[PDB]
Design an enzyme around this catalytic site. Structure first.
Site, PDB file in Angstrom:
ATOM      1  N   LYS A  48       0.853  -1.206   0.000  1.00  0.00           N
ATOM      2  CA  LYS A  48       0.000   0.000   0.000  1.00  0.00           C
ATOM      3  C   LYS A  48       0.884   1.250   0.000  1.00  0.00           C
ATOM      4  O   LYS A  48       1.923   1.317   0.698  1.00  0.00           O
ATOM      5  CB  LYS A  48      -0.886   0.027   1.243  1.00  0.00           C
ATOM      6  CG  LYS A  48      -1.625   1.349   1.417  1.00  0.00           C
ATOM      7  CD  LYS A  48      -2.890   1.204   2.185  1.00  0.00           C
ATOM      8  CE  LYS A  48      -3.606   2.552   2.329  1.00  0.00           C
ATOM      9  NZ  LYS A  48      -4.509   2.851   1.173  1.00  0.00           N
ATOM     10  N   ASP A 142     -17.007  -1.840  12.738  1.00  0.00           N
ATOM     11  CA  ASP A 142     -17.419  -2.065  11.346  1.00  0.00           C
ATOM     12  C   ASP A 142     -17.304  -3.492  10.880  1.00  0.00           C
ATOM     13  O   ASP A 142     -16.674  -3.788   9.875  1.00  0.00           O
ATOM     14  CB  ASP A 142     -16.696  -1.096  10.387  1.00  0.00           C
ATOM     15  CG  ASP A 142     -17.513  -0.818   9.119  1.00  0.00           C
ATOM     16  OD1 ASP A 142     -18.787  -0.912   9.167  1.00  0.00           O
ATOM     17  OD2 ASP A 142     -16.876  -0.525   8.084  1.00  0.00           O
TER      18      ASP A 142
HETATM   19  C1  LIG Z   1     -13.912  -7.336  -0.046  1.00  0.00           C
HETATM   20  C2  LIG Z   1     -12.382  -6.988   0.074  1.00  0.00           C
HETATM   21  C3  LIG Z   1     -12.068  -5.884  -0.895  1.00  0.00           C
HETATM   22  O1  LIG Z   1     -12.872  -5.631  -1.772  1.00  0.00           O
HETATM   23  N1  LIG Z   1     -10.932  -5.175  -0.763  1.00  0.00           N
HETATM   24  C4  LIG Z   1     -10.614  -4.169  -1.787  1.00  0.00           C
HETATM   25  C5  LIG Z   1      -9.348  -4.529  -2.496  1.00  0.00           C
HETATM   26  C6  LIG Z   1      -8.240  -4.777  -1.482  1.00  0.00           C
HETATM   27  C7  LIG Z   1      -8.669  -5.772  -0.401  1.00  0.00           C
HETATM   28  N2  LIG Z   1      -7.595  -5.933   0.598  1.00  0.00           N
HETATM   29  N3  LIG Z   1      -7.078  -4.871   1.318  1.00  0.00           N
HETATM   30  C8  LIG Z   1      -5.967  -5.322   1.883  1.00  0.00           C
HETATM   31  C9  LIG Z   1      -4.998  -4.374   2.514  1.00  0.00           C
HETATM   32  C10 LIG Z   1      -5.439  -3.414   3.411  1.00  0.00           C
HETATM   33  C11 LIG Z   1      -4.583  -2.431   3.875  1.00  0.00           C
HETATM   34  C12 LIG Z   1      -3.256  -2.421   3.467  1.00  0.00           C
HETATM   35  O2  LIG Z   1      -2.299  -1.583   4.030  1.00  0.00           O
HETATM   36  C13 LIG Z   1      -2.533  -0.867   5.208  1.00  0.00           C
HETATM   37  C14 LIG Z   1      -3.472   0.158   5.264  1.00  0.00           C
HETATM   38  C15 LIG Z   1      -3.598   0.887   6.435  1.00  0.00           C
HETATM   39  C16 LIG Z   1      -2.809   0.593   7.532  1.00  0.00           C
HETATM   40  C17 LIG Z   1      -1.907  -0.428   7.475  1.00  0.00           C
HETATM   41  C18 LIG Z   1      -1.756  -1.169   6.316  1.00  0.00           C
HETATM   42  C19 LIG Z   1      -2.805  -3.362   2.558  1.00  0.00           C
HETATM   43  C20 LIG Z   1      -3.671  -4.334   2.091  1.00  0.00           C
HETATM   44  C21 LIG Z   1      -5.771  -6.696   1.605  1.00  0.00           C
HETATM   45  C22 LIG Z   1      -4.820  -7.711   1.835  1.00  0.00           C
HETATM   46  N4  LIG Z   1      -3.759  -7.533   2.599  1.00  0.00           N
HETATM   47  N5  LIG Z   1      -4.990  -8.907   1.224  1.00  0.00           N
HETATM   48  C23 LIG Z   1      -6.065  -9.082   0.446  1.00  0.00           C
HETATM   49  N6  LIG Z   1      -7.051  -8.226   0.166  1.00  0.00           N
HETATM   50  C24 LIG Z   1      -6.849  -7.044   0.767  1.00  0.00           C
HETATM   51  C25 LIG Z   1      -9.918  -5.283   0.285  1.00  0.00           C
END
Ligand SMILES: *CCC(=O)N1CCC[C@@H](n2nc(-c3ccc(Oc4ccccc4)cc3)c3c(N)ncnc32)C1
Ligand SMILES: C=CC(=O)N1CCC[C@@H](n2nc(-c3ccc(Oc4ccccc4)cc3)c3c(N)ncnc32)C1
Length: 290
Positions: A48, A142
């Protein structure tokens, strides 16, 4: 030129030539996340990007969720951070890459997800939520299928990016609260969301049917009996009782996580051998991207 990733208990040096960009993770509400293969191990990871120029709020929330993830290295049910890389203009955050969320699995299944899977998911998500509250004082606020992630190793983990803590999943007691602008409520509201999410995933149908407006959904949450699992789908007695307890309308009688963790449904799914991994792989192999 060089950062570090720690995966599998091992710290690695990583330069950009060590990372293959495999593209978008998919339709998020987030953005600027890439699936990347780390060439030194073969792990595919999610990276990210947080721009220094980004919105203050969005960035503050990222950093707060990051703070929690970094301190949650001892929880198997929270997505792990492998590393960070700070440049003059950006921060890159490497995260454990899961397969997809329960919302998208529901869409792929075009219907019910089997109890067996939902049982393992319940164990994991309750433990994740309980961990968040007990270790970090975090009330998720949530809990919904889009925040429940699975992978082809059979892991089930919670999400929040929001983990730092949606009218459809709102508990009754939260709908017209005494003080909504000073919202110091408790984890029982999340228990209700979990129960809704389970009914939705077990039936293939979000339980507040044919509501045209958000307000109409809220009217249903308040006026109607809790949307209990149906009796005609072969659901176990333990799953039906578990969902009924989660969907206790009077929040003062709705169990907390520590009580849910004693429920026979959880006890049984802690011990039951369920090949979530093979099942997830089959689904992902036979269905199309929503
Ligand atoms: C239904 C799930 C969905 O539609 N999504 C949208 C596409 C991405 C998917 N997803 N998100 C992560 C992820 C979240 C956050 C970060 O980094 C981060 C943000 C804030 C604070 C700390 C870290 C990276 C990735 C996913 C991961 N890791 N793996 C699979 N799907 C993920 C959610
Ligand atoms: C190959 C994709 C590429 O270049 N991209 C696509 C993505 C946005 C741009 N990006 N990405 C990085 C970067 C930085 C770090 C990292 O892994 C970590 C390693 C250790 C700890 C945490 C993460 C992976 C990529 C990056 C960067 N260094 N500088 C500029 N743009 C960047 C251009």
């Amino acid at each position: 030129q060089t950062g570090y990733l720690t995966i599998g208990g091992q710290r690695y040096q990583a330069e950009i030539n060590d990372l293959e960009n495999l593209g978008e993770m998919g339709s998020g509400t987030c953005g600027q996340v890439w699936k990347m293969r780390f060439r030194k191990t073969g792990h595919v990871i999610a990276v990210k990007q947080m721009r220094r120029s980004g919105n203050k709020e969005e960035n503050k929330r990222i950093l707060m969720d990051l703070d929690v993830v970094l301190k949650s290295h001892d929880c198997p049910y929270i997505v792990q951070c492998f590393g960070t890389f700070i440049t003059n203009t950006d921060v890159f955050i490497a995260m454990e890459l899961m397969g997809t969320c329960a919302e998208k699995l529901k869409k792929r299944m075009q219907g019910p997800i089997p109890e067996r899977i939902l049982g393992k998911m319940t164990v994991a998500i309750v433990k994740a939520l309980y961990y968040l509250k007990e270790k970090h004082g975090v009330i998720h606020r949530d809990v919904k299928p889009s925040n429940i992630l699975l992978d082809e190793r059979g892991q089930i983990k919670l999400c929040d990016f929001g983990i730092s803590g949606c009218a459809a999943y709102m508990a009754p007691e939260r709908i017209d609260p005494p003080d909504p602008t000073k919202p110091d409520y408790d984890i029982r509201a999340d228990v209700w969301s979990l129960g809704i999410s389970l009914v939705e995933l077990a039936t293939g149908q979000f339980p507040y049917k044919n509501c045209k407006t958000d307000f109409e959904v809220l009217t249903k949450v308040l006026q109607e009996e809790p949307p209990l699992l149906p009796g005609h789908m072969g659901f176990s007695g333990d799953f039906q009782s578990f969902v009924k307890d989660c969907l206790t309308k009077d929040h003062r009688k709705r169990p907390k996580y520590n009580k849910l963790l004693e429920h026979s449904f959880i006890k049984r799914y802690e011990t039951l051998e369920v090949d979530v991994a093979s099942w997830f792989k089959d689904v992902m192999a036979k269905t199309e991207s929503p």
